[PDB]
Amino acid sequence: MTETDKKQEQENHAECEDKPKPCCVCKPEKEERDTCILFNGQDSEKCKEFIEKYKECMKGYGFEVPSAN
């Protein structure tokens, strides 16, 4: 539970991975989507999985589709 966590950790001081992680977004699943498109999609039955995954992402993130990205 929360209190099981929030004391301190003291795992890593050297916070080398200067890479903020907003969560949701849709990076990998977009990349997978456009990759599926490129391979054998445009329309196809084989891309719908990634197209669906592409929306839930952004809906959750809080944008019902981007402007253009």
UniProtKB/Swiss-Prot annotation:
PROSITE patterns, per database record: CHCH
Subcellular location: Mitochondrion intermembrane space
UniProt entry tagged with the keyword Cell division: no
InterPro entries, per the entry: Cys_alpha_HP_mot_SF, Cyt_c_oxidase_Cu-chaperone
Record: residues binding Cu cation: C23, C24
Sequence motif: Cx9C motif 2, positions: 47-57
Chief site of localization: mitochondrion
Biological process according to GO: copper ion transport; mitochondrial cytochrome c oxidase assembly; protein farnesylation
Pfam families: COX17
Keyword match Iron: no
Function: Copper chaperone for cytochrome c oxidase (COX). Binds two copper ions and deliver them to the Cu(A) site of COX.
Name this polypeptide is given: Cytochrome c oxidase copper chaperone
Organism phylogeny: Eukaryota, Fungi, Dikarya, Ascomycota, Saccharomycotina
Gene: COX17
